[PDB]
Amino acid sequence: GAMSVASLPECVKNFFPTEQLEFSSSITADEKPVLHEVFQKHSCGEMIDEVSKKHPELGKRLATVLEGNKKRLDGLSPAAVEYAKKLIHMVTTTLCSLTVGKPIDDADAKRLHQEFQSLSSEDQAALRKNNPDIKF
């Protein structure tokens, strides 16, 4: 639909939480230009205020994505949390680029996969338990 999520490289799609993908699917043709206008001011914490100013319902849906992402960090070790924040940074940057029409470089996603592989078995299992929908 408006967002073109399917056009993303596979290794990038692998890391997307469900809530980001469901949000992207939901974007209507008149909603996308709202995200474009707002994200073009920057390079979501703070995006929410600006988006909601323009389109309350869209901003509500964006806030729900961020609320969703929080749960995924619960109970994780310092190393696993460091990893997860890098994963979400990758996903955020991508979705912003997709929205504004910048190219997508999947090198950051290949780095995430390599990094996951060198985590302890206990941290890999904890990440999978908190994110059963992600292909690490």
Long-range CB contact pairs, 37-44, < 8 A, 24+: 39/96, 39/99, 39/100, 40/100, 42/96, 43/96, 44/92
Closest CA relative to residue 136, chosen from 71, 75, 67, 90: 90
Task: Tell me the C-alpha distance between 106 and 94, whole Å.
Answer: 9
Report the Cα 60 to chain-centroid distance in Å.
Answer: 16
Domain positions in the chain are 1-136
CB 136 within 8 A of CB 116: yes
Secondary structure of the chain in HEC code, one letter for each residue: CCCCHHHCCHHHHCCCCHHHHHHHHHCCCCCHHHHHHHHCCCCCCCHHHHHHHHCHHHHHHHHHHHHHHHHCCCCCCHHHHHHHHHHHHHHHHHHHHHHHCCCCCCHHHHHHHHHHHCCCHHHHHHHHHHCCCCCC
Give, in words, the CATH class of 1-136: mainly alpha
- Spatial CB neighbours of 62, under 8 Å, sequence gap ≥ 6: 23, 44, 47, 48, 51, 52
Q: What is the resolution of this structure in A?
A: 1.8
Measured CA distances, 54 to 18, 47, 50, 113, 132 (Å): 25, 11, 7, 37, 34
Closest CA relative to residue 123, chosen from 88, 68, 75: 75
Report how this structure was experimentally obtained: X-ray
CB 51 within 8 A of CB 96: no
